[PDB]
Amino acid sequence: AFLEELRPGSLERECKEEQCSFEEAREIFKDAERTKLFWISYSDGDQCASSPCQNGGSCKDQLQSYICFCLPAFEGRNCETHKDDQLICVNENGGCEQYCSDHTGTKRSCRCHEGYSLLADGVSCTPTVEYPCGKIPILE
Amino acid sequence: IVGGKVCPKGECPWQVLLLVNGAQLCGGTLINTIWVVSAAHCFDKIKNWRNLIAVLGEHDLSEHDGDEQSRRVAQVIIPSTYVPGTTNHDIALLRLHQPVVLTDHVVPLCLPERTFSERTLAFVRFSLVSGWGQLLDRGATALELMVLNVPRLMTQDCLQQSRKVGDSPNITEYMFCAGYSDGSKDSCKGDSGGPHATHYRGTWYLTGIVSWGQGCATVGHFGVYTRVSQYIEWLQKLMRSEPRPGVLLRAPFP
Amino acid sequence: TVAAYNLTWKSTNFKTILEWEPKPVNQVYTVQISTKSGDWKSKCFYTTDTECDLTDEIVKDVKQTYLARVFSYPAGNGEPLYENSPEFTPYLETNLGQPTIQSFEQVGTKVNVTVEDERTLVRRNNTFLSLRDVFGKDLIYTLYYWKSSSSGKKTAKTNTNEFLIDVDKGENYCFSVQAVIPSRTVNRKSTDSPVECM
Numbered sequence: 001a002f003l004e005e006l007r008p009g010s011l012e013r014e015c016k017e018e019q020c021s022f023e024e025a026r027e028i029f030k031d032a033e034r035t036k037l038f039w040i041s042y043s044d045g046d047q048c049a050s051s052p053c054q055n056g057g058s059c060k061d062q063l064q065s066y067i068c069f070c071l072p073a074f075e076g077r078n079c080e081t082h083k084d085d086q087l088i089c090v091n092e093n094g095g096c097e098q099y100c101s102d103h104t105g106t107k108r109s110c111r112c113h114e115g116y117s118l119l120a121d122g123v124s125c126t127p128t129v130e131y132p133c134g135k136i137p138i139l140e
Numbered sequence: 141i142v143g144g145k146v147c148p149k150g151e152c153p154w155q156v157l158l159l160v161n162g163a164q165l166c167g168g169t170l171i172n173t174i175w176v177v178s179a180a181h182c183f184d185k186i187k188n189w190r191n192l193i194a195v196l197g198e199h200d201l202s203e204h205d206g207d208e209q210s211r212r213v214a215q216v217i218i219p220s221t222y223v224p225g226t227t228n229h230d231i232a233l234l235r236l237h238q239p240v241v242l243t244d245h246v247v248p249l250c251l252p253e254r255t256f257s258e259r260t261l262a263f264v265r266f267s268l269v270s271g272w273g274q275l276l277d278r279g280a281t282a283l284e285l286m287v288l289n290v291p292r293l294m295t296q297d298c299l300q301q302s303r304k305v306g307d308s309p310n311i312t313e314y315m316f317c318a319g320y321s322d323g324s325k326d327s328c329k330g331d332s333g334g335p336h337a338t339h340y341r342g343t344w345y346l347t348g349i350v351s352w353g354q355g356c357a358t359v360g361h362f363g364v365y366t367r368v369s370q371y372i373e374w375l376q377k378l379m380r381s382e383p384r385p386g387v388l389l390r391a392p393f394p
Numbered sequence: 395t396v397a398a399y400n401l402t403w404k405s406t407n408f409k410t411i412l413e414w415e416p417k418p419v420n421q422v423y424t425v426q427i428s429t430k431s432g433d434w435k436s437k438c439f440y441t442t443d444t445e446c447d448l449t450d451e452i453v454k455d456v457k458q459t460y461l462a463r464v465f466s467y468p469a470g471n472g473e474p475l476y477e478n479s480p481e482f483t484p485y486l487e488t489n490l491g492q493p494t495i496q497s498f499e500q501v502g503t504k505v506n507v508t509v510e511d512e513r514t515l516v517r518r519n520n521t522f523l524s525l526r527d528v529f530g531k532d533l534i535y536t537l538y539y540w541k542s543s544s545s546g547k548k549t550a551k552t553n554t555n556e557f558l559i560d561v562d563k564g565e566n567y568c569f570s571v572q573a574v575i576p577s578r579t580v581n582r583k584s585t586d587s588p589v590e591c592m
């Protein structure tokens with residue numbers, strides 16, 4: 001609209017209220033390095049606009065990239081991994097103190113060496129004999 | 141053990157001293173009241189099979205005390221695959237003639253399940269090795285039980301960090317490296333058969349047997365240990381077997 | 395199986411992702427990470443991704459030196475093939491994220507410029523720590539600013555997240571800021587903030 005083009009140059013009018021091209025911005029800032037400094041971010045795009053952070057995460061925009069901050073139960077570049085879904089024996093022994101058995105479709109279980117029995121907590125083991133294997137009584 | 145510490149009396153209560161004709165032979169590991177694990181190569185030179193003794197509760201080889209318990213070794217079982225004078229399948233399972241009595245000074249180390257040992261114990265970095273072996277390469281042996289903390293390597297890393305030696309033994313799937321390549325700290329010949337013991341969530345488990353190395357604490361080399369996880373089913377089946385009349389038994393493996 | 399290769403640490407504000415090649419074909423990966431003397435922890439179990447978020451392990455201690463390794467396992471499933479990563483020390487190597495100018499105010503004949511607190515992945519008590527929370531005096535912000543009608547740039551530097559600068563009467567100034575860890579030799583500065591003008 002030519003009637004909106006009657007005033008001297010203005011960052012606010014040309015680039016903030018409207019989109020501006022590199023040369024419009026150059027005519028405002030004039031100096032090559034000032035113009036480049038503005039443009040690098042202004043033309044970059046908000047990489048968080050596609051909402052890439054899942055599971056209630058929070059996105060922060062960067063140059064051509066973003067960072068997701070996850071809720072405590074999640075991880076991954078996009079908070080895509082559910083920590084609650086990782087209870088398997090290759091992940092820190094399934095949280096079992098002694099032996100761990102995977103069961104697909106269902107929850108892993110924990111078990112004990114001979115001389116021990118499983119506590120009611122389902123992970124911890126307790127001796128059932130006076131001198132179970134693998135404990136040093138002299139220290140106690 | 142080179143560069144270790146004295147194990148305070150009772151603090152390594154599964155360590156076995158093996159004797160032949162009353163003279164120090166090798167270490168071993170008690171795993172319940174009747175059965176001891178040691179290294180096959182400890183038996184390459186034995187003529188007198190009826191004169192092997194296991195001592196439990198031993199600490200200072202210069203003084204006898206009331207914690208020591210001696211038992212005759214009734215059977216020595218080694219994989220048929222093992223070849224005397226070589227390194228592979230370096231394991232022996234020993235049946236004592238009468239059980240030991242468990243005490244504050246005499247306690248077995250737990251033999252772990254295979255999968256637990258491969259997927260969890262194998263990634264515990266440090267473990268302890270012990271014995272009354274040499275205190276320096278080709279030096280005198282120890283009179284008080286010695287113990288050393290060593291970090292474990294996957295075999296690819298051990299190969300990549302080890303100085304090449306022409307015609308040296310292959311490190312096979314039945315072995316693993318542990319220790320330091322800077323000449324400071326290692327297990328030693330007279331420690332052979334002794335435990336590499338791993339602590340995991342409050343319980344100690346047998347993961348390795350002191351087996352071989354290029355000298356002791358040689359720069360550019362690690363200690364090599366028998367990988368006990370490969371033998372769990374072989375040991376458990378043999379521990380259920382019937383005694384036989386002669387001491388030595390070479391049993392099929394797997 | 396084929397071993398992973400070009401293992402590369404991507405990390406900004408302690409969000410830390412290990413990347414590698416190749417795209418898997420009939421194989422899957424699992425990653426482990428440790429400190430030099432600690433146990434190996436596994437992550438990203440049997441993934442077909444060629445990346446693994448390790449943020450949660452490294453924020454436990456940002457000043458430790460970690461090594462990772464990527465295992466290859468054949469589809470349908472002694473030691474698997476693997477490759478080690480470079481060592482990574484987060485405090486020394488994590489990128490500083492792009493900052494944002496939060497506000498500028500003219501008070502007196504001077505302008506205060508405030509840099510938004512930069513949020514990092516290190517947690518304390520349900521909240522994420524700022525870059526200044528983590529780095530303290532190791533972190534400064536630098537301000538690149540100019541008067542529109544003059545040639546030449548001006549730089550200011552602060553130990554806090556605020557600059558208080560002198561300005562000439564009735565002129566426009568524009569500003570841009572960077573995070574900087576002066577003690578570093580490599581990866582010392584963030585990218586510049588977007589430019590904000592009066």
Ligand SMILES: *[C@@H]1O[C@H](CO)[C@@H](O)[C@H](O)[C@H]1O
Pocket residue numbers: 046047048049050051052
């Ligand atoms: C928008 O979100 C997609 C995935 O949903 C991501 O790949 C882009 O990086 C982001 O800008």
Ligand SMILES: *[C@@H]1O[C@@H](C)[C@@H](O)[C@@H](O)[C@@H]1O
Pocket residue numbers: 056057058059069070071
């Ligand atoms: C961004 O941060 C994440 C962690 C959540 O707290 C969100 O509610 C917030 O917008």
Ligand SMILES: [Ca+2]
Pocket residue numbers: 004013017018
């Ligand atoms: Ca307009």
Ligand SMILES: [Ca+2]
Pocket residue numbers: 023024027
């Ligand atoms: Ca124009």
Ligand SMILES: [Ca+2]
Pocket residue numbers: 044045046047061062063064065
């Ligand atoms: Ca952006």
Ligand SMILES: [Ca+2]
Pocket residue numbers: 198199200201202203204205208
């Ligand atoms: Ca004694």
Ligand SMILES: [Cl-]
Pocket residue numbers: 160161185186187188189
């Ligand atoms: Cl003899």
Ligand SMILES: [Cl-]
Pocket residue numbers: 210211212236237238
């Ligand atoms: Cl007897």
Ligand SMILES: [Cl-]
Pocket residue numbers: 257258262367369
């Ligand atoms: Cl193993």
Ligand SMILES: [Cl-]
Pocket residue numbers: 510511512513524525526527555
């Ligand atoms: Cl900050």
Ligand SMILES: [Mg+2]
Pocket residue numbers: 012013017
């Ligand atoms: Mg306006």
Ligand SMILES: [Mg+2]
Pocket residue numbers: 014020024
């Ligand atoms: Mg215009």
Ligand SMILES: [Mg+2]
Pocket residue numbers: 023027
């Ligand atoms: Mg022009």
Ligand SMILES: [Rb+]
Pocket residue numbers: 013014015018019020021024
């Ligand atoms: Rb415009």
Ligand SMILES: [Rb+]
Pocket residue numbers: 004005013014018
């Ligand atoms: Rb316009």
Ligand SMILES: [Rb+]
Pocket residue numbers: 009024027
């Ligand atoms: Rb213009």
